Structure formats: structure tokens, C-alpha cells
Design an enzyme around this catalytic site. Structure first.
Site, short mmCIF file in Angstrom:
data_model
loop_
_atom_site.label_atom_id
_atom_site.label_comp_id
_atom_site.label_asym_id
_atom_site.label_seq_id
_atom_site.Cartn_x
_atom_site.Cartn_y
_atom_site.Cartn_z
N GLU H 60 0.81 -0.98 0.17
CA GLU H 60 -0.87 0.34 0.22
C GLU H 60 0.66 1.24 0.20
O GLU H 60 0.53 2.55 -0.71
CB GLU H 60 -1.15 -0.11 1.39
CG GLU H 60 -2.28 1.03 0.85
CD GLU H 60 -3.40 1.10 2.34
OE1 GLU H 60 -3.65 0.30 2.55
OE2 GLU H 60 -3.27 2.95 2.41
N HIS H 61 2.00 1.28 0.58
CA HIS H 61 2.80 2.41 0.23
C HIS H 61 3.51 2.24 -0.94
O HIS H 61 4.51 3.61 -0.99
CB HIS H 61 3.62 2.06 2.09
CG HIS H 61 3.03 2.73 3.38
ND1 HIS H 61 3.95 3.09 4.17
CD2 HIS H 61 2.39 2.28 3.88
CE1 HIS H 61 2.93 3.97 5.03
NE2 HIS H 61 1.58 3.29 5.66
N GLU H 137 3.70 5.88 11.20
CA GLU H 137 1.84 5.59 12.03
C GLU H 137 2.19 4.62 12.82
O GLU H 137 0.68 4.61 13.00
CB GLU H 137 2.20 5.13 10.36
CG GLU H 137 2.23 5.98 9.52
CD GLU H 137 1.73 4.91 7.70
OE1 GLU H 137 1.84 6.09 7.06
OE2 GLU H 137 1.30 4.37 7.70
#
Ligand code: HEM
Lengths: 106, 54, 53, 54, 57, 423, 49, 446, 146
Positions: H60-61, H137
Site C-alpha cells: 500500500e505504501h 504511523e
């Protein structure tokens, strides 16, 4: 319209008012009401002026009841001058409870 | 005060033999005891409310 | 004053609790019968006839 | 702080018999509760001393 | 190209009957998270975030 | 195949009330009453009245009790909301198709027959403190509130949220006075989604014929400029730097909106470097720490504010503001390609069309339009209006910012945050 | 970092019906509540006696 | 003027095609000048092992940060230039990549999505940059008491199973996931039968199908190939995790019984029931007057800053219950009132409140499915879970069926005399003992 | 703070300085609310070490002998590892702070940069003050010469 029968109906009402005798202590009718939940809510809703007048009237009456005394006749609350100051607050509180109770039926 | 005096009457009848005037008046006092409490005092409170426009 | 508890919600709440109220009634009756060794009912239970004569 | 107010035993005595907010205007007719309590302790004490011999 | 708040910038508040209070504007915070540590007061003396009455069957 | 869409229907009444409806044959309906009653219409003697009003929507009315509003709406699974800007209050109501009448009746009672009973008003006053505290946990809310108080002498200067000194002090009479002065036919728009135009028109003529209020749309917002500075020590500095721009509905406002997208509004990509964002890239060149920048654009009936907003580390606040200010200066000096304006016009056009996708966004757009312009403008003419912005208009808008008397608000550790003076 | 919080192995203390991680526990909850409530039932019978 | 019933019928049919791929391609046509397009994948943390855990999140990153055809920022530049929005999420079961764009930009939007999903660069310098981003995060997520309790709830309820794992994974996995670990994840998981191309808005289905055949051809069209797993079932455990932290100003508690899966018909009646208990927040209008007895008492007695009901669904299991946020002296009262409502609904749900629950669901469903984006998400997710799009009229028929008897049977099945999973974080001294929570799961009067 | 800020004058003069100065004289005499609970032992130790030094200090005595004071000063007040003297330099700036209150009475203060203490110009300012009018001289007077 209504004349002769009305004054007699008022006469029995006025007679009973004097025999009740809360007026000898300077109480209004609405000062003497039993504090249920409906009534306690009505007190809570009273404006500042009426709330404080109510307390002074109770205090002055409890003070008299302790001394087993009454006011001078001059100072008794006249049936004609008796302000039903709680009634419209209480009526609205009752109306509110009854609507909740109807909603709870369905 | 009618209840208190009814109770005084019942205490009188309690202490007396089961014979002529005492039986029927003992019955009437017994009826009145239950009439004052169950019927008459709750009717007085309602009339008194109506009288005060309450 | 008890007109309050009359309406379709309260009838449904009666219907929901009725098998439970009657099953508790069954607990109480069998409980009282057991605790007093009650004669009338317990002669009629086909095992537990330990009086006989 | 007072001893009377926060001692776990004296707390109970305080809230029942000392600092208990009471109506200014309660009559003669309110005396009968304490009098019933007096009556109970009287029946207890005399009764024990009777039970010593009965 | 109207609406004052949907010109994106000035602040709108919402109160509801059944739904959580909002404040919304174009001030930035999505690309503020992206280079990182905004260690946010999320469910301190607070509310609840993202929109309820939002479930499927 | 779907159904071919119905057109929006639109009616101005002689009393000045606008009615707008669309029949999208949708399972849910949405009704909004939009009013020229936002915080700008408060004065010095009654600050926070419109906050307390926004919080008072389920209180007892002449036709429905507090209890009835809450239970009757919830029984049909409905919603009642009040959205405020500095200009508008917006009373919205959602339910299923079959339930519009009960929700209408409740809507009408809230807005035209509220009682503001002294005890219900009193019990509500601590809600001001809660609602404010929740809102002011975003540093952005305190900054934008200070920004307006710095900017304006007057009217747009007012907070959306009640001043603390006023909590507990807003009276039943002030609420009654606010509704009578402001919730009138000439200051009002009735918007409906998935109801017929005759049903709305009937509601408007029967129930929304009020006037003994105020003449229209301001005291006039006197721009002033200046700064407010809130020390916080708050790990991050939030700063906003602004000048007077253009009133909504002017062609100049459109130039400001395009300028915003040249400079850079929000992100388009989850976790992206914001490559086509002019402000972001200019700050990113000489600042290597975590930050944010955005163009800020707030347009109103009689004024506007344009510039930028920065989140940065305390020590980097000055660098970030100055980098961002210089990047606008580069655009004011004429360094702006035609591809940049065309990309920025594309972001605006897509952003607007997406903004009107939902029922919620469409109704707010139709409501605001009806208040601001007295008309409905379809998407293709909004898009035509965007297209008509030349490169020169964008340059001129940037020039007005650079030369304009500034307003600034900042919160954080401010030891390295400059003073307008120092820019 | 809160993501480093795994729950420790309870295999030592678990009933044999609920040792399999790939088996639903629902299949044995009736039997397991059955056993423990039968214990309390048998006790109350004994205490009643 | 149309009825609610007529309006549901007038909602247009979801068109579905399948590619030779196995890639499903599905659309809901509307009038809108804008669209949402995206790829929905049957991939998430439930598919990952202890060693793999956090890989999907790592992907996703990297997904937006360069492909073979558009290197570095070039994809960003294209999305931004057309005024489009590009977004992603990873749950435990489902990954999604979606574009909000203009309808006229649907060909490039589909082109870019194919390029992301197939041809992601994973440049070694980028993986290293993302390592530090993910770790920060994690430090951020730690401050969110809500995210923490829900991770704890999963971690205790699902214990020895892959559903115990968070999406983002542990910090050691973040620091030691190689390029080869990620390539293997993408090879095993990003396969055409396990992925759906979804669209909602101003498009024809035919056009979407044509673009699917242009850009998604040859993912699987000679390959598919040996070693797949299907999902093993995840054991639920009645259990408690208690992160006591008195430094924190408010307690977070989440409590759930075992839900059934996605597939199961009695999800609908459970949701009716959950709507009756509802949600609350301190910024709601209505203290005393709110219909929900939990909401009403929580507001009146100040028991609460917030609560929410939830029915989280996975394949063949779920988390069904409630989360709340409160003062240290309010946890015991909140639990008593919460559990009393579950017990009330199990034993003695009346008809009027069930109708309210039904209506709230009808409103929630129609309000949610409003915009190209939530409808697109609904297409993509539904085809993964159900295999069809379940039309609004079907949901209506399923909601209408639910009465008080249905609420009381269905609640009894899941709530009554069942072992909950409990997660507590914060000033939690007054959090009831588990035995006393367990005892709240039945009534002695019943 | 709460006791001090019950005079409206204290909030006005505190805002007046924050408006006036960029810098240093801008600081409040009273702790900012956000800082209450947050001032550390190390900061107090750091403040005393930096500022309570021989070069920044004066020992004044009334009804004690000079040798006793001089002895105290040499024995006990020989400290230096602090700061070089008397400011960051107070940067005058100008501006306004406005606090809505509804407070029955408006308190306002309007000011410009004048003269540093000890300059001859400061004396002109002090005389100007008494032309214009400082406090009252008469209990309940009309302040005729003000
Ligand atoms: C626990 C404390 C008490 C004890 C130990 C107790 C014990 C006694 C004893 C030993 C007798 C028999 C001797 C006698 O008749 O004189 C007696 C009789 C009596 N008790 Fe109590 N007593 C107690 C309290 C009560 C109370 C509370 C009452 C009710 C007011 C009561 C009513 C009487 C009466 C009426 C008699 C008969 C007296 C008589 O005419 O001779 N006693 N009790």
C-alpha cells in the site's frame, strides 16, 4: 351570563377555603401541594421571583406552626387574591408525562 | 376523629359480654371501621380536591 | 391511573414473559410438593411410591 | 475536622442524633418514636432481670 | 462556483439530533499526516470520528 | 439504462423566498431550509446567540414537544441537522420517501414555531462548552476563528462558536429576537430533494410567509487587517496568512479559486509527494522536516479572504511561511505557464462536480446558491465560468494578495513565527 | 508498537475441545457449558437434599 | 409521486462480466459527470503468516510511488493533472485501490489502476523510505485509543489465528520485510480470480469491459498455478485483555461475542437489534428523549462520552457487540446498562422498537449508497464476499421479514449465555471482572 | 493569577505589553495558562543559575551596618556562571489586543514608545504625565488641574 348559582358554588368554595385555614399562616393553595415528581418539576421550572416568594411563604408558615401561632386577620390570604402560580407549570409537566406514557404504549 | 371514636367504641365492645345491644352495635362499629378507611376518607380527599379547584 | 399499562407494547411484553412465569410456577409447585412430601400429588407419581402400606 | 464527624462509629451517631436536619415545627406527636425506643429498652432490661428468676 | 464552505477553506459547524458534531474546512490535515507524527488527541475529552448511521444489511 | 434525469425546478416568490426542487427518483428524501442567519448577523450585545440556536433544534415548539421531535424523527429512522457558516444557517431533514410530511412538519415547527422555554434554554447552556471544546481540539478551528477576528472590524469577525464569557448568558429573548429578525421570507430558501415542486410551493405559501425582520445581507463587512498570536507550545505551529480577495459570484472570485489550485489545495494521492502543488514543492526545497501547506480560499457575500495555511515545526515556522509567500510572489511577478492554469482548472472542475455527487453536497450547493445568487446555475455553466478565467486574471489575483493589507493568525510555539512586519 | 502485543499461549490451560485454532469453538460451547452447569446442577440437588 | 418501494425498483441493475483471466468486471451506470473506478482484491492480514504480517500494508505504501511505465512521481503527476483522486485501503480481508475521476477520464483511470496492480516497481530505495514512514504511523496509531482497543479485541478474540494480527503488523516485521517477501505476496495474492474491477457513475458497462480486456489481459491467462491456500476458519475465544493505564484521561472498552460470517442471513436481524441499542456521543441533541434506553440513560446519568454498536464481519466469523468511552467511575454502570439491553432484546424485544431498528437500517443503507465512491466500494466488496451484488429491493425484503420474534431468536443465538471477548485500555480499575461480565450474559429471572 | 486578574487593569496592562513588544517586555508577569503544571525543577534551577549572579544583583539593607552587609556579600553572594547583562533588547513593534468581556465598563490603554529609564527624556515624560494627570489628590475631587 351566569349569576345566582355561580355565587353559591363560589360560596361553598370560599367557606371551605376559610375552614382549610392555610391562609391563617399566609399560605397560598399552591404552597400546600404534596411534592410528588410532577410537583418537584413544576417548582424547578418556576421563575426566580415566584420561587423565592414560595420559600419565604413556607418558612413563615413553618415558623408559625412551631410557635403554634397564626397571622393577624389583616394578613391572611384572601380567597379572591389567591394566585394559582404553580398550576400552569404543573399542568404542562402532567401533559409531558402523559405523552411519554402514550408513546410507551405503542 | 370518627375513626378514633369508632376504635374507642370497639375497645368498649371488646370488653363486654356477647349479648343484646352489644352484638348489633359491635357489628355496626366493625362495618364503620372498614367504611371510614376503605371508602369514606378517600371520598373526603376527592371532595376536598374538587372544593379547592384541584 | 393504571390505564398507563394498557396498550400493544405491554400486551407483547406479557406474551414474552408468560412461558417464563408459568415455568417458574412449575418450579414453585414441584418445590412445595417435594418440601412437604405432599400426599395428594406424590401418591400419583408412578415411581416415588415409598409409602405403599 | 471533628472526631464526631468522621470516626466510623461516631459518624452513625452524628447523622442520627446530633447533626440530623430536623423540621423546626414537629410537635409532641413526633415524641413517640424515641418513646417507643425507650419502651423497647425498658422491656429489655426489666425482662432480662425477670428472666434471671422465672 | 458557489457554496461558501464548498469553495473549500472557511469553517462550517454541524449539530445533529442522532449524529455526531462536525467541523470542516480547507485548512490541510491529510497531507499533514503524510510526513509524520501528528500524535493526535483522538478520543480524549471528545466526540467520535467518521459519520454514523453508516452500515450495510 | 437508468431513468433520464428530471430538471431542477426553481421559484422566487413576491416575498423573496426561493423554492428549489429535484425529483431524482431516490428511496430517501432530503429537505433543507437555508437562512441568512449565520454568525455575521450577531452584534457585540448578543455574541454566541446563533451558536446556541444551532444547538436548540430539538427543543419544544408550538406544534411538537422536545420529546415528540426526538421520538417521531427516530421512529422513522430520520435525521435533523443544523449546519452554520458565518453567513448561513441550514436546517436539514432526511427520511425515506413515505415519511416526508412528518419530517416537514417537524422542520417547520423548529424554524417558525420554537418556544425557547426558559428551563429548556437553561439546561442547554452547558452544551455550548462541550460543542466548543470538541471543535477546538482541531488547532485549525482556533486559527481560522482568530484569522477572521484579525481580518474584520465587524461581522465576519464573529466566531461560529460562542465566546466563553457568554456561556450561561444567552437569553430566551435573544433567541426569540434572532429568529424574528432573521428567519424571514426574504432571507430564506426552501430546498427539496425527492419531493415534488407543488408540495414544496404549498409548504412555502402556507407556512413560510414571515416578514418583520431585517433588510438584507449585512452591516457590511469592513476589512481591517492585523494579527492574533496564540502561544501554546503545541509541538506544531499552525499559521494562516491572508489578504482581502473577492466577494462570491464576482468573476474575480473565480480567478481566486483557480489561483488556489495553482498554489495547491488538498492532496489527490494517498501518501503522495504533491508534485503539481506549487506551494508544497517550494517549501519542500529548503525545508526537510515534516510540514504542511495549503492555499486558503474563503469567499463571502461582500468580502473574501485568500492566501495560505502552514503546519510546521516551531523552529521551521518562519522558513515555511517565507518560502510559501515567495512562491505566490513568483506567480504575481508573472511566472505562470498555460499548462499550470489548465491543470488547476481541471482540478477545480473535477473538485466541484465531485462536491455535488451526493444528495448532501447537491442540496448544500443548491441552498447556498439560492441565498447568495437568487438562482440555480447548472454544472456546465459553472464549468464555462471556470473556463473564462485567463492566465492574467490568476496573475492579478496573486498581485492583489502580495500588495494587500494582511491578516495573520498563528498558534503554537511562536519564538520563530514572524509578525507580518517581518515578511 | 501496540501491534507487538500478541496474546500468550494458553494451550496448557485450554479444554481439549478448543485447542484447535482452525476449529470453531461454537461446535463445543454447548458441551462445555453443559459440563460446568451440570456440576452446579448436581451440587444444588445435593445441597437441597 | 413515487413510493419508497417503487424507488428501490428504479435503482438500476449492477452489470457483471468475467474476463478469461478470471477477473470480474462490474458496473452501476448513472447520469453523473464523475465516476469512481477501482480494483478490489481478496487480500489482507488474515492471509498473512507471522513472518509475512504487514506486507500488504507495506505494498500500500509503495503502490502509488512508481511503476515500470511511469517511474517515481509520474503517476502522481498524471492523476493530479486530470483533477483525479487516488486512494487505497487494507482491512484484514480486503485490499482496494480506487480513482475518483471525471467520466471522460475512465480510459486513463483504468490504465493507471492496471499499471499499479500488476507493474509496481518496489525500488529498494523506496522500500527503505517507507520503512521509516510505517514506523511513525505505528507511533501515531498508538495515540488512538479507539484503534488500540479494536486491535486488542481482534488480538484476544482471535488469539492463535491470523485474524488476531493487525493490518500494519509488528515493528520488527516492518524493519525486516525484504523486496522478495513483498514480490512473493504480490505473486501469490494479486491473481485475477481473487480480484474485481468495479465502477460507478457516468459510464457504459461495455466500455469498462473493453478497458478490462485492454489492460488486465495476461495476469493469469496461462498461469494461475500450484500452491494456493483457502482461508482456514478462525477460532473465537471468550477472553479479556486489560491494558491498565491511569495516565490516560478516559477509559476505552470494546466487548464482542462471535458473529457469523458475511454470508449468513441473520446479520440483517442483528443489525436491526444493534440499531435499537444505537450509537451515542456527547454532542447529540437529546439527552433524556432519545429512543435507545442505553443512549437515554447514558446521557441522563452522564455515563458516557460515546458508545457505538458494531457487527464486524469476516468469512465464517465476526465481532458483534459494542465499544464505549467513559470516565474511570462510569465503566461498571456502562457495562450493566449495555448488557441489560442485550438481555432485554434476547428475552423481551417488543414490536414498535423493532420497526424503529428496521427504519434506521433502511435509512442507513440508502444514505450510505449515495455517491459514486460508496456504490463502487459496495460493488467491489459484494462480489468478493457474496459473489453477486445484492440489490436494494432484496435488502428491503430481508429487513421487512424481521419482527420482534426474529429479533429475540437471533439475539439469543449470539448473545444469550455466551462468552464475550473484552478489550480494555486506560483508567480501567472499575472495569468489571470477567466472571461478572460473563454473568451479565444471562438472566436469572429467565 | 485569578486573584490578580480580578482587577481589569492587570489584563489590560498585560495585553498592552504583548501588543507593544516583539520580544521580552512582551512577557506576562503571570504564568500563561497552558504552562500551569508544566514548569519544571530544571527550568527553576536554570533560571536561578542564569540570573541570580553577582553582576545582576544588589544587596540593600536598612538598619544594618555596611561591614555586616559587605561581609555577607563577599562570603555568600560571589556567583558567576550566568548571562551577559540586561536584555535580548526589547524590540518595540506596536499593535492591538482586544478582549470582549461585556464587562459594564470598558478599560482601554493607548500608548507609544517613550524613553528608557535614566535618560533625561524619561524626566520629560514624567512631567508630561503630571500635566496630563496621574492619580487624584483630593478625596472625591473634580480633578481641576488634571
Ligand atoms: C428480650 C427482652 C424480654 C425478656 C427477656 C422478657 C422476659 C419476660 C419474662 C421472664 C416474663 C415472665 C414474668 C412475668 O410475667 O412477670 C415476661 C412477661 C411479659 N412480657 Fe416480657 N420480656 C421481654 C420483652 C418484652 C417485650 C418487648 C414485651 C412487649 C411490650 C413484653 C411483654 C410482656 C408481658 C405482657 C408479659 C406478662 C407480664 C405479666 O402480666 O406478668 N416483654 N417477659
Amino acid at each position: 351570563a351566569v349569576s345566582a348559582s355561580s355565587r353559591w358554588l363560589e360560596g361553598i368554595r370560599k367557606w371551605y377555603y376559610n375552614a382549610a385555614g392555610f391562609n391563617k399562616l399566609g399560605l397560598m393553595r399552591d404552597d400546600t401541594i404534596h411534592e410528588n415528581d410532577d410537583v418537584k418539576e413544576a417548582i424547578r421550572r418556576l421563575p426566580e421571583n415566584l420561587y423565592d416568594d414560595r420559600v419565604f411563604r413556607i418558612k413563615r408558615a413553618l415558623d408559625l406552626s412551631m410557635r403554634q401561632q397564626i397571622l393577624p386577620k389583616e394578613q391572611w390570604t384572601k380567597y379572591e387574591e389567591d394566585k394559582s402560580y404553580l398550576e400552569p407549570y404543573l399542568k404542562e409537566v402532567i401533559r409531558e408525562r402523559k405523552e411519554r406514557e402514550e408513546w410507551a404504549k405503542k | 376523629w370518627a375513626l378514633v371514636a369508632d376504635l374507642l367504641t370497639l375497645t368498649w365492645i371488646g370488653g363486654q359480654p356477647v349479648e343484646h345491644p352489644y352484638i348489633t352495635i359491635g357489628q355496626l362499629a366493625s362495618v364503620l371501621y372498614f367504611l371510614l378507611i376503605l371508602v369514606l376518607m378517600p371520598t373526603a380527599g376527592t371532595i376536598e380536591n374538587k372544593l379547592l379547584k384541584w | 391511573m393504571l390505564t398507563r399499562f394498557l396498550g400493544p407494547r405491554y400486551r407483547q411484553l406479557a406474551r414474552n414473559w408468560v412461558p417464563t412465569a408459568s415455568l417458574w410456577g412449575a418450579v414453585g409447585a414441584v418445590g412445595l410438593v417435594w418440601a412437604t412430601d405432599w400426599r395428594l400429588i406424590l401418591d400419583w407419581v408412578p415411581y416415588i411410591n415409598g409409602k405403599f402400606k | 475536622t471533628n472526631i464526631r464527624k468522621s470516626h466510623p462509629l461516631m459518624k452513625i451517631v452524628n447523622n442520627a442524633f446530633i447533626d440530623l436536619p430536623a423540621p423546626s415545627n414537629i410537635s409532641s406527636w413526633w415524641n413517640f418514636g424515641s418513646l417507643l425506643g425507650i419502651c423497647l429498652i425498658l422491656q429489655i432490661l426489666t425482662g432480662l432481670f425477670l428472666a434471671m428468676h422465672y | 462556483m458557489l457554496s461558501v464552505a464548498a469553495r473549500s477553506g472557511p469553517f462550517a459547524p454541524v449539530l445533529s439530533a442522532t449524529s455526531r458534531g462536525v467541523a470542516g474546512a480547507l485548512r490541510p490535515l491529510v497531507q499533514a499526516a503524510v510526513p509524520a507524527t501528528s500524535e493526535s488527541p483522538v478520543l480524549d475529552l471528545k466526540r467520535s470520528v467518521l459519520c454514523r448511521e453508516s452500515l450495510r444489511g | 439504462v437508468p431513468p433520464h434525469p428530471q430538471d431542477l425546478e426553481f421559484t422566487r416568490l413576491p416575498n423573496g423566498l426561493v423554492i428549489a426542487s429535484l425529483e431524482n427518483y431516490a428511496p430517501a428524501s432530503r429537505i433543507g431550509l437555508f437562512i441568512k442567519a449565520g454568525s455575521r448577523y450577531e452584534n457585540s450585545n448578543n455574541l454566541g446567540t446563533s451558536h446556541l440556536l444551532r444547538l436548540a433544534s430539538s427543543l419544544t415548539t408550538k406544534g411538537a414537544s422536545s420529546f415528540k421531535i426526538t421520538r417521531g424523527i427516530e421512529a422513522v429512522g430520520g435525521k435533523l441537522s443544523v449546519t452554520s457558516t458565518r453567513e448561513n444557517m441550514a436546517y436539514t431533514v432526511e427520511c425515506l420517501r413515505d415519511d416526508v410530511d412528518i419530517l416537514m412538519e417537524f422542520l417547520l415547527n423548529v424554524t417558525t414555531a420554537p418556544e425557547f422555554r426558559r428551563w429548556e434554554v437553561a439546561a442547554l447552556q452547558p452544551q455550548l462548552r462541550i460543542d466548543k471544546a470538541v471543535a477546538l481540539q482541531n488547532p485549525q478551528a482556533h486559527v481560522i476563528e482568530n484569522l477572521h477576528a484579525a481580518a474584520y472590524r465587524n461581522a465576519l469577525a464573529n466566531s461560529l462558536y460562542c465566546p466563553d464569557y457568554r456561556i450561561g448568558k444567552v437569553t430566551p429573548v435573544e433567541l426569540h429576537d434572532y429568529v424574528q429578525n432573521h428567519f424571514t421570507s426574504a432571507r430564506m430558501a426552501l430546498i427539496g430533494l425527492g419531493v415534488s415542486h407543488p408540495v414544496l410551493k404549498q409548504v412555502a405559501e402556507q407556512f413560510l410567509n414571515i416578514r418583520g425582520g431585517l433588510g438584507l445581507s449585512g452591516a457590511k463587512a469592513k476589512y481591517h487587517g492585523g494579527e492574533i498570536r496564540e502561544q501554546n507550545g503545541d509541538s506544531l505551529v499552525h499559521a494562516a496568512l491572508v489578504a482581502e480577495s473577492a466577494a462570491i459570484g464576482s468573476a474575480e472570485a473565480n480567478a481566486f479559486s483557480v489561483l488556489q489550485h495553482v498554489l495547491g489545495a488538498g492532496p489527490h494521492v494517498k501518501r503522495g509527494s504533491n508534485a503539481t502543488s506549487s506551494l508544497y514543492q517550494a517549501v519542500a526545497k529548503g525545508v526537510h522536516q515534516p510540514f504542511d501547506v495549503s492555499a486558503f480560499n474563503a469567499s463571502y457575500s461582500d468580502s473574501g479572504l485568500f492566501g495560505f495555511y502552514t503546519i510546521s515545526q516551531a523552529a521551521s515556522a518562519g522558513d515555511v511561511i517565507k518560502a510559501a509567500y515567495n512562491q505566490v510572489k513568483t506567480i504575481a511577478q508573472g511566472n505562470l505557464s498555460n499548462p499550470d492554469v489548465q491543470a488547476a482548472k481541471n482540478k477545480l472542475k473535477a473538485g466541484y462536480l465531485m462536491s455535488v455527487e451526493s444528495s448532501e453536497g447537491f442540496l448544500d450547493e443548491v441552498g447556498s446558491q439560492a441565498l447568495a445568487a437568487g438562482s440555480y446555475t447548472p454544472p456546465s455553466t459553472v464549468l464555462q465560468q471556470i473556463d473564462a478565467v485567463a492566465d492574467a486574471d490568476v496573475i492579478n489575483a496573486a498581485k492583489k494578495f502580495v500588495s494587500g493589507r494582511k491578516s495573520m493568525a498563528a498558534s503554537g510555539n511562536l519564538g520563530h513565527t514572524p509578525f507580518i512586519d517581518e515578511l | 508498537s501496540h501491534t507487538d502485543i500478541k496474546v500468550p499461549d494458553f494451550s496448557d490451560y485450554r479444554r481439549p475441545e478448543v485447542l484447535d485454532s482452525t476449529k470453531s469453538s461454537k461446535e463445543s460451547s454447548e458441551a462445555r457449558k453443559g459440563f460446568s452447569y451440570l456440576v452446579t446442577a448436581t451440587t444444588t440437588v445435593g445441597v437441597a437434599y | 409521486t413515487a413510493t419508497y418501494a417503487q424507488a428501490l425498483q428504479s435503482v438500476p441493475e449492477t452489470q457483471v462480466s468475467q474476463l478469461d483471466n478470471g477477473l470480474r468486471v462490474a458496473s452501476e451506470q448513472s447520469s453523473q459527470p464523475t465516476c469512481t473506478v477501482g480494483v478490489w482484491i481478496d487480500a489482507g492480514s488474515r492471509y498473512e503468516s507471522e513472518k509475512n504480517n504487514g506486507a500488504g500494508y507495506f505494498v500500500e505504501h509503495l503502490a502509488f510511488k512508481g511503476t515500470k511505465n511511469r517511474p517515481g512521481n509520474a503517476l502522481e503527476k498524471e492523476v493530479e493533472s486530470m483533477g483525479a483522486h487516488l486512494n487505497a485501503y487494507s482491512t484484514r480481508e480486503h485490499t482496494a485501490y480506487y480513482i475518483k475521476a471525471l467520466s471522460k477520464d475512465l480510459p486513463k483511470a483504468v490504465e493507471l489502476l492496471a499499471d499499479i496492480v500488476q507493474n509496481c516497481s518496489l525500488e529498494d530505495s523506496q522500500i527503505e523510505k517507507e520503512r521509516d514512514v510505517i514506523l511513525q504511523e505505528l507511533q501515531e496509531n498508538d495515540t488512538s485509543m479507539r484503534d488500540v482497543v479494536f486491535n486488542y479485541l481482534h488480538a484476544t478474540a482471535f488469539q492463535g489465528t491470523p485474524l488476531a494480527q493487525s493490518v500494519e503488523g509488528p515493528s520488527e516485521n516492518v524493519r525486516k520485510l525484504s523486496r522478495a517477501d513483498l514480490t512473493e505476496y504480490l505473486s501469490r495474492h494479486y491473481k485475477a480470480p481473487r480480484m474485481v474491477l468495479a465502477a460507478a457513475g457516468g459510464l457504459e458497462h461495455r466500455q469498462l469491459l473493453d478497458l478490462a480486456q485492454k489492460h488486465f489481459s495476461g495476469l493469469s491467462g496461462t498461469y494461475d498455478e500450484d500452491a494456493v491456500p483457502t482461508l482456514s476458519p478462525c477460532r473465537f475465544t471468550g477472553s479479556q485483555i486489560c491494558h491498565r493505564e491511569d495516565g490516560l484521561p478516559l477509559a476505552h472498552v470494546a466487548i464482542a461475542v462471535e458473529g457469523p460470517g458475511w454470508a449468513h442471513p441473520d446479520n440483517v436481524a442483528l443489525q436491526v437489534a444493534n440499531a435499537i441499542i444505537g450509537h451515542y456521543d456527547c454532542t447529540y441533541g437529546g439527552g433524556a428523549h432519545l429512543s435507545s434506553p442505553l443512549a437515554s440513560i447514558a446521557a441522563t446519568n452522564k455515563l458516557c462520552q460515546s458508545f457505538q454498536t458494531f457487527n464486524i464481519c469476516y468469512a465464517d466469523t465476526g465481532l458483534l457487540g459494542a465499544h464505549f468511552v467513559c470516565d474511570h467511575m462510569s465503566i461498571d454502570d456502562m457495562m450493566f446498562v449495555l448488557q441489560g439491553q442485550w438481555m432485554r432484546l434476547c428475552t423481551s424485544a417488543t414490536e414498535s422498537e423493532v420497526l424503529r431498528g428496521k427504519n434506521l437500517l433502511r435509512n442507513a443503507l440508502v444514505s450510505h449508497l449515495d455517491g459514486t465512491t460508496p456504490v463502487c466500494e459496495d460493488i467491489g466488496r459484494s462480489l468478493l464476499t457474496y459473489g453477486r451484488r445484492i440489490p436494494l429491493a432484496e435488502w428491503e425484503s430481508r429487513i421487512a421479514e424481521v419482527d420482534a420474534r426474529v429479533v429475540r431468536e437471533v439475539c439469543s443465538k449470539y448473545f444469550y449465555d455466551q462468552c464475550p471477548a473484552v478489550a480494555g485500555f486506560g483508567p480501567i480499575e472499575q472495569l468489571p471482572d470477567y466472571n461478572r461480565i460473563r454473568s451479565g450474559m444471562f438472566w436469572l429471572r429467565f
